Design a protein around this ligand. Sequence first.
Ligand code: LPP
Ligand code: TRT
Ligand code: TRT
Ligand code: TRT
Lengths: 370, 324, 54, 56, 65, 48
Amino acid sequence: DVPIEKIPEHANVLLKKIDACLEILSKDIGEVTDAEAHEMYFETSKFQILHIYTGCVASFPEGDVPPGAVECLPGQVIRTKVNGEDVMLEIDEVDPGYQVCWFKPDVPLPENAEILWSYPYEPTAALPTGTTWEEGQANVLIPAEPTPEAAVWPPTPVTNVYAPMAEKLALKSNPELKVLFKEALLQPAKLLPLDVDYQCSHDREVVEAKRDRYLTALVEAEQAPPLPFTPDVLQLQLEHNVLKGELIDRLRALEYTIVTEQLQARLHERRLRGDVIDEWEELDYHPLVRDDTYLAIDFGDPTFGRYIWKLFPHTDGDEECMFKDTRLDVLPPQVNPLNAILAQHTAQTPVHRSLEKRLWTEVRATAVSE
Amino acid sequence: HRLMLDEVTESYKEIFYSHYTGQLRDVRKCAHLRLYDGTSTVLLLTNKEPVELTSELLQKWNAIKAAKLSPEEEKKARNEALIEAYKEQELHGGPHVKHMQGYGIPADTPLLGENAKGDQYTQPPESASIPLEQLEWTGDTVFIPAEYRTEMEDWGRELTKLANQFLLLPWRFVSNAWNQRRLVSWFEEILQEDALIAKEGGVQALSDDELKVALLDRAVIRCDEELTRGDMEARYKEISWLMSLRNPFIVLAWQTGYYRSTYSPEDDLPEASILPKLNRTVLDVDVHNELAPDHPEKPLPRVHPALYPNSHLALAKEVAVLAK
Amino acid sequence: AAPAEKPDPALDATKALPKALEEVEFFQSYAVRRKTGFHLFNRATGSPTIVGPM
Amino acid sequence: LMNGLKMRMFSLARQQAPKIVHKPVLSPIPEHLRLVKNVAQVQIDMLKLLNAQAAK
Amino acid sequence: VPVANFRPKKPWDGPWGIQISQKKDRPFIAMWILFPLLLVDHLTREYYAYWHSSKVPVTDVFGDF
Amino acid sequence: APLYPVLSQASLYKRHFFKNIKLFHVVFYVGAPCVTFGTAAWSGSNRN
Ligand SMILES: CCCCCCCCCCCCCCCC(=O)OC[C@H](COP(=O)(O)O)OC(=O)CCCCCCCCCCCCCCC
Ligand SMILES: COCCOCCOCCOc1ccc(C(C)(C)CC(C)(C)C)cc1
Ligand SMILES: COCCOCCOCCOc1ccc(C(C)(C)CC(C)(C)C)cc1
Ligand SMILES: COCCOCCOCCOc1ccc(C(C)(C)CC(C)(C)C)cc1
């Protein structure tokens, strides 16, 4: 009660569904940038935080420190305002033979000092302006973040032998070609250059056998079939019904997995809105893993890893197997066991039975004919 | 890494994680779990030595039993096959039991001290005097499953109780031996019921409710499924063949796969499906063909029985039963 | 009886002392101090004390 | 990077909403469905050719 | 027709995950109530016997005395 | 259409305060008053 033409409609539906899933799941949450979440990273620095909004910062060679200058060693955190942006600067890898210090305006600068960046004079101002790092004053590097190639699943190839045959059918299935056959067999003298043939030809038997060959070639052309062989319709309907059932069961399994993908996507929608999801509330949206995980808890064995290294031996020795995706490195082979089965069948059978089977097929063809 | 085997891995995955994929399972992949065990043997006890039973000897004995000969000829042919198999195994290197940890055949007893008569350090048994041509079967048999990992003894206090719960048997406040006997009695009942169904004309002679109740007794169906008749018949055939092998562990592994149901947290999801219900037939079950264990991380697709050569000939019984 | 087990790298000991030295280096990194306001009474010889600079 | 200095700059702003990054999710379901599509089209063309032969 | 291996929840399916979280974090909540109670129980305590004590605090558990 | 008793964002915000404690966050924060006003330093000296 389910014809084979109705399948691609179902495939279109499931493609729409999984695309609506993957367009959501392709998004992911980046690193958090809230300063309130990372203020303790600066609280726990090896030096107290310098709230610098006045004076200048200068680099000068190592040696005696000017009295009044605040050293800025590696690990020093500095709260400033840069081009209207409140920022924290963490000192890292000051060059050798040189040191950096904050010089308030009360402090005179030494000789051979280089002002890296300076602040303006704004004593009446309540909200200071900070600095303005011009192009060439500071080389700021944005991380490149080269987006690698999107992981594409390999499409398996499918040899369509019958599409050339469909094209040949579209070619032969014309009314004009049959009209030409109808007017060629009735009057083939029109086509051929018979007056020239009889003129040059010394024996009329050649011209007669020539026309008798063209007639037979035309009768064979019209009476030939689209195919070059005699298909056994029973074995083809057999393979068709088997492949149909395998396709319906495959579509049912894919819908079964799509349900879990549109569940993980319905949950990921909330995560994208900024809502915090509990670990177990999130596990409930993975019901099949939730069940097996709950049973592992019931048993009480929190260990893991050799089970993975046995089920997927390509991960053996890989401690960071969980943080990778080697499904493309390890794909199921496209080998047909039917070839090994027919090979063992031919190896067991003799040759006279193979020729007998050719006779059974020929007699079956004549039986279907009669 | 110390306990599992790397060749049964893909079959293990297909048997225990098919609720993830939604694909059907092949019973032969559950039968592959017997690779954890050793070779199950059957020693026939004779008046001289024990002999390991083989498919050839069993075929000969079935042929002699089918010929319906006089007992004077029957016993003679049986003993001829017996001495032939004895010579065969003596050329093989003795029975399989000699070189298996936990089992063994003793050699001739030793002679201690002054009882040792020079070079003859041994004392053969009385039956060594009997000539080999008088080899006769005593009528006694010894079955040795050689279940080193599957045996019901090593299961434990919990697994047996849970198997009896799953089969709706009594389980509380009893030893694992008594629950084992209860399980074996249930198993015997199911086999006798299979025999009576085969006498009464198979599964197709049964009604729908009767088949539903049979599958509930076999513990392969839950009442929240509403399968078809062909699916029910195929399921029965599957578990019938699997229980013919007489192994509760693989039986339970097969049965438990049909009882992994989930609950969704949302009301809209899961959506109403578009495809029809899953339907099968008795023909879809491949029992008459062997299946090698798939190599780890190299699984092979499933071949229908119809694609095999001479399938219309092999399935002719099932074809006649279904078309009729 | 003759199990033939391969060596497991997780059972080796080649990370405990490096990790302890990493923890101690993290500890001593917070001992870095500037030159301004620095004073430490040395011993009578002029050599530094033990507890002083820590 | 400055002359005689290197530094790490951190912004100071409350993040009101999460930052999204397009990490495409690998899945075999679309290729499964496309394989099903191709096989079904093969069988449909096969049936059409067989009907054309048997009737013409 | 619905999808297979799916069903509605039942009482024997146990509590939900959010309920399991609410069960888990109750000890963590009672921690805040009990550690101050521990410190108060230690600080507001008095010894029970001295060199001058003619009596010792007795606590009849079952009222037999 | 979640069928479970969805827990509010503020309730999760409050429970996170209770379950995001660390071991040192308990040990040192409760041991300092304990060690100072305990059987070692103050209460012990008094009561002994
Ligand atoms: C000349 C007198 C001595 C010198 C001058 C006075 C002392 C001045 C020094 C400062 C005051 C010392 C107080 C001594 C009190 C004492 O005797 O200590 C002992 C007494 C109890 O001793 P007794 O019961 O035996 O009399 O304890 C108290 O007084 C209770 C004080 C409560 C303190 C709580 C502090 C909480 C801090 C926040 C921590 C948060 C973490 C979570 C924990 C819940
Ligand atoms: C002489 O002493 C040698 C004894 O060696 C002890 C080896 O164990 C070292 C454990 O030390 C730690 C402590 C914390 C950690 C980390 C950084 C992983 C803690 C964490 C989880 C908070 C980040 C790692 C190692
Ligand atoms: C958890 O275990 C880690 C604890 O490790 C503590 C190690 O204690 C020794 C630290 O004390 C010192 C010792 C020397 C020094 C400095 C004085 C190294 C010498 C210096 C700064 C002059 C080069 C600093 C701290
Ligand atoms: C030489 O070492 C002396 C320091 O020992 C101090 C003893 O402190 C008691 C426990 O302190 C902690 C607290 C937390 C931890 C961590 C942060 C690693 C806890 C963890 C694993 C839950 C993150 C480790 C030790």
